[PDB]
Amino acid sequence: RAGNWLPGSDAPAWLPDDLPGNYGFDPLGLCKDPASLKRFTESEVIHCRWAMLGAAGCLGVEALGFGNWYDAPLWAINGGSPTWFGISVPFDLNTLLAVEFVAMAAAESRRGDETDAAKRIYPGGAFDPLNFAKGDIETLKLKEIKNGRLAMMACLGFVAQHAATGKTPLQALGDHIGNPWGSNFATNGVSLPF
Amino acid sequence: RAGNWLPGSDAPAWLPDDLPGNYGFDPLGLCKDPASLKRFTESEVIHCRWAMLGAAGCLGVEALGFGNWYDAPLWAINGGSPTWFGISVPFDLNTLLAVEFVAMAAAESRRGDETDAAKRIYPGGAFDPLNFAKGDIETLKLKEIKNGRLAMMACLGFVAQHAATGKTPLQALGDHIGNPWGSNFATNGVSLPF
Amino acid sequence: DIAGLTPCSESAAYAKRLKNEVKGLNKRLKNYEADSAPAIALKATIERTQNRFANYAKAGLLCGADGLPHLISDPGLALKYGHAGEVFIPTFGFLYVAGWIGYVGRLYLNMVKGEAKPTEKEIIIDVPAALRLTWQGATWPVQVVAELRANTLTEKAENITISPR
Amino acid sequence: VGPKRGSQVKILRPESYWYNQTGKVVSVDQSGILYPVVVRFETQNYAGVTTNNFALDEVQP
Amino acid sequence: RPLWMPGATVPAHLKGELAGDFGFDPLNLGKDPQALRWYQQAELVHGRTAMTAVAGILIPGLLTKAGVLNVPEWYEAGKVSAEQTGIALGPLLAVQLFMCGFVEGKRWMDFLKPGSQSEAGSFLGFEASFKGTDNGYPGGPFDPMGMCNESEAKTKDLKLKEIKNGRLAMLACLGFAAQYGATGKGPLDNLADHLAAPLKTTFVDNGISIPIHL
Amino acid sequence: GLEPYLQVCAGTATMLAVGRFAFLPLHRRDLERSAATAGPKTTGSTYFDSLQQEASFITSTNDPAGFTLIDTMAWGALGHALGFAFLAASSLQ
Ligand code: CLA
Ligand code: CLA
Ligand SMILES: CC1=C[C@H](O)CC(C)(C)[C@H]1/C=C/C(C)=C/C=C/C(C)=C/C=C/C=C(C)/C=C/C=C(C)/C=C/C1=C(C)C[C@H](O)CC1(C)C
Ligand SMILES: CC1=C[C@H](O)CC(C)(C)[C@H]1/C=C/C(C)=C/C=C/C(C)=C/C=C/C=C(C)/C=C/C=C(C)/C=C/C1=C(C)C[C@H](O)CC1(C)C
Ligand SMILES: CC1=C[C@H](O)CC(C)(C)[C@H]1/C=C/C(C)=C/C=C/C(C)=C/C=C/C=C(C)/C=C/C=C(C)/C=C/C1=C(C)C[C@H](O)CC1(C)C
Ligand SMILES: CC1=C(/C=C/C(C)=C\C=C\C(C)=C/C=C/C=C(C)\C=C\C=C(C)\C=C\C2=C(C)C[C@@H](O)CC2(C)C)C(C)(C)CCC1
Ligand SMILES: CC1=C(/C=C/C(C)=C/C=C/C(C)=C/C=C/C=C(C)/C=C/C=C(C)/C=C/C2=C(C)CCCC2(C)C)C(C)(C)CCC1
Ligand SMILES: CCCCCCCCCCCCO[C@@H]1O[C@H](CO)[C@@H](O[C@H]2O[C@H](CO)[C@@H](O)[C@H](O)[C@H]2O)[C@H](O)[C@H]1O
Fold first, then answer.
1. End-to-end CA distance of chain B, in Å?
2. Which of B101, B109, B113 sits opposite F14 (nearest CB)?
3. How far is CA B179 from CA A88, B182, B183, E22, in A?
4. Residue E138 near residue E132 (C-beta atoms within 8 A)
5. Residue C72 CB burial class (10 angstroms; 0-12, 13-18, ≥19)
6. Which stretches of D1-61 are assigned E, i.e. beta strand?
7. Which of E87, E88, E119 shows the shortest C-beta gap to B4?
8. Three-class SS of residue F3?
9. Ligand 2: which of C97, C100, C101, C131 to mutate, judged by most atoms within 8 Å of the beta carbon?
């Protein structure tokens, strides 16, 4: 185990002790069934990896200073232009949708086409070019899941800040740093009642 | 089987397990009689194939940019000429009706005459040139029957939306995406009574 | 509206039917002294008439050229145009009481069946038990359905005597 | 021979006012009498008779 | 055992087992075991729905009448929200019917066949949660904080509290509708007006409860 | 050209051809099962009721697939009512 969700409890027993990221947090008992156990495990890691990429892109674009994550999917509504890293790209909404569908379809299909199940979670090989999975893999996976869970929570944070505060995540961060006791989720006017 | 129409239900014993597409859906027990089951099974696949072609054609004539599924036999009434892909075809409703009759009178009678009850729905041979059946056919049959049940339902949707919404399938879609809550079967007048 | 049936409120004949009908009673009131019971009575008939010939119109009762209110049966027409109080709503009211009477009756019949001589509890009705089953028919629809979804409302076809074919 | 005295048997005789109906076996003549099972009925036929001797095959407990 | 009326003859099928079994089946409606089971589930659903509704008519009102919120009357909020949200009645209702229909369908089949929704493979990953514990008590995804797992007597207390509070909330909803139907005011208004002159402001002196012509 | 010949000829030809190679086998199969199996044989015997008894000229056609004169006058009759319903329909309606 990596710890305990509530220090002093013991309720989770279906969860294997070797499961990467096993903090023993299953309040609704969704992992009892071994097939659902495997599916949820694969879904969690996938969600984590995507969220980690999304979080890097959402803030990364702001860091470099080419716009915020929310402003990215708007040009097509206004019939503007796509621009990656500032450099322009000659595409449009329908073509991007089509190219995305086919790519994601051929890739995700193959990943699910896998039967070993463990590979579906950790394929390695071509997916392990630097081959850092030679040792300490059992703990590096904990880092992958822990950072991934944090990434998923952070992604929700970006959406919530934009939903209530409206300002960009970096801007909202500075607002709190500049006025911590004044600017917060408590004073956004959406988090608290009415 | 392929699943359960009502997770939890059971029975439809009259519906065999091998039947390609058995999700158990026979509430009015229309497949109890073995003979009727044979005819219904063959008819379903026949309907699926025709339905899939129709749905593709209904959207294709609009997607490519040559008109809509409804306003297509208009030339024969308005007093115009046939037009496949723009290219004016040199025929008249009368000659088309006759060509169709003899053409369908022969192919359909040929299929019906064949008495195998397994090669009357799945002839293969010349009907399977690329020989895709080899290696596994059940999954393709399920996709054929599942994709077809989607098409049969869609083909009904196009007619129903044209009858009430009075809009082309592609155009009606945009209307929904445009103002989802304000452009549905409900906000139409014919669908719901109140 | 509906089938050329004008609303009695806008029905001129309906108004004339009032004028002429109250005149026919205000001519029978004259041949009587102002305080006589005959006259107190004819004045009540004139008031009651003038109230009814208005309660009807206020209820939006469409009437034809005859000036006599007509009723709409189609549920869609009655509901869509606020004519539900006529026939429609009354329909369920009777059905509820009708089924109530029938259900209570069968409850009693099936209780006296078995009990000693069931034939002598049909002539000399057991008023006590008959009075303990009347209110049981209030929720008859709930109980009747529970019997359909349990196969107890009807009898097996192999236990009902049938005439030789 | 015959249903036990007192046993209720469903009448199977087609032209019987008590067909598809039940009745108690008053007795069963153990001779070769054609119809030996005497069956009594609370209900009475149109004539007014409330009993009838049915054959063994005409009765089913 | 506490009875709805002291001295009332307990039916027979109402043996102290169901939460709130005070022996009240005068019209012997729950005589059938299956009927009683369905009625039991129906009662729980009715009470839970009413409790989560009277809480949405009284609570929001008591705070509006205390300046905290501005929620409209329960008999006017519908129109206010419709003009506020802008969603047409038709579309709003239809969507609700489909969502409620699906959840009702799963619960319905679970009764028809107990613990059937947990079919292997049915709801992607979750079927297990869709198992159920006893008639109207889908323990698991519901009751997450595990309050009905403490003891076998905290369940029987927390279950008598659901039924008595439900029955009360169900009658409360009927009251609110009748109160506004006759008084023409909000529930708090009716209570305040009553407490003002308690012996002069009752259902008798409303004009609609008893159309006194004589 | 487009005179009655075009409409009448086409109708006759199509029906005869469709009834000489397409529905001809189904037609024969239906005739058999109907008259031999479910239906029995009529005109048991006796009386000058031989009129109801099957003829013979009808059962004398070298035409392959046994296209009898009645079949030629059958599909052809169906064809002469399509040639005259198509021409007539264009006349007015
Ligand atoms: C007892 C037999 C019976 C008979 C003979 C009729 C006959 C009629 N009904 Mg009807 N109806 C019945 C039972 C019956 N109904 C029952 C039991 C219900 C409750 C479900 C309804 C609910 C109902 C509604 C909601 C409506 C009708 C309507 C109608 C009229 C036209 C509708 C139609 O084409 O067919 C009959 C239709 C039905 C039986 C129910 C389906 C609802 C119809 C199809 C919607 C049609 C709307 C449109 C305005 C009708 C055009 C009529 C035309 C003169 C313009 C018609 C004269 C329409 C009407 O005229 O009201 C304005 C209509 O809106 N009925
Ligand atoms: C418990 C009493 C009872 C009940 C439940 C029924 C029920 C029924 N009768 Mg029936 N009937 C009854 C008494 C009853 N009848 C009596 C006493 C007579 C002699 C006058 C008849 C003569 C009669 C005829 C001729 C016919 C029916 C028919 C029918 C069926 C058609 C439905 C209908 O509209 O009712 C119809 C009811 C009547 C026509 C008259 C009976 C109405 C009385 C007032 C109701 C009985 C009340 C009872 C005294 C209450 C007892 C309470 C107890 C505590 C003492 C229906 C299932 C029809 C049928 O067979 O359908 C196929 C039909 O042809 N009944
Ligand atoms: C354990 C437990 C137990 C018990 O029993 C029950 C329960 C409680 C239920 C459980 C829990 C669970 C959970 C927590 C879950 C969560 C989830 C999530 C959050 C996800 C996310 C998720 C998230 C994610 C993926 C994310 C994604 C993203 C992406 C892709 C991308 C994005 C972007 C960027 C780059 C930038 C640009 O400009 C734009 C875009 C393009 C837009
Ligand atoms: C299962 C069950 C069981 C129980 O017992 C009962 C019940 C429930 C009843 C059942 C159900 C059933 C069902 C669902 C059925 C369905 C059907 C359909 C819809 C079909 C379609 C169907 C459809 C189809 C074919 C389609 C077709 C089409 C076509 C050919 C074509 C068309 C076209 C196009 C291209 C375009 C143009 O411009 C025009 C045209 C030329 C015109
Ligand atoms: C499952 C779960 C999970 C885990 O285990 C934890 C947790 C979360 C805790 C759980 C939850 C639960 C719940 C949701 C509960 C609810 C409750 C309620 C709401 C009640 C109400 C309840 C409610 C009620 C009784 C109601 C009441 C009301 C009343 C009396 C009223 C009265 C009145 C009337 C008529 C009228 C006038 O004019 C006024 C007045 C005088 C005012
Ligand atoms: C909407 C409505 C009407 C519409 C009628 C239409 C379109 C169809 C009607 C079908 C009808 C009325 C009836 C069909 C009945 C068929 C069956 C098998 C039902 C039989 C009922 C039975 C056996 C119940 C008998 C009862 C039991 C067992 C216990 C007690 O409940 C008493 C009793 C005898 C009722 C219209 C005429 C417009 C007008 C406006 C009301
Ligand atoms: C020999 C041979 C062949 C054949 C030929 C032919 C040419 C056939 C045809 C035949 C025919 C040619 C048939 C037909 C028939 C028909 C009929 C017999 C009938 C007709 C008519 C009608 C049916 C009409 C009716 C009517 C009238 C009268 C009036 C108006 C109305 C109507 C129109 C309805 C060939 C060459 C292939 C080769 C080998 C040899
Ligand atoms: C817009 C066009 C709409 C469709 C137009 C055509 C409608 C469908 C055709 C109607 C005429 C069918 O004509 C005939 O039907 C029968 C009945 O199955 C078929 O009969 C076939 O299947 C039956 C099934 O029991 C077998 O017993 C029979 O041996 C076999 O030949 C014939 O093959 C077909 O030639």
1. 41
2. B101
3. 31, 5, 6, 54
4. yes
5. buried
6. 8-11, 22-28, 37-40, 51-54, 59-60
7. E119
8. coil
9. C101
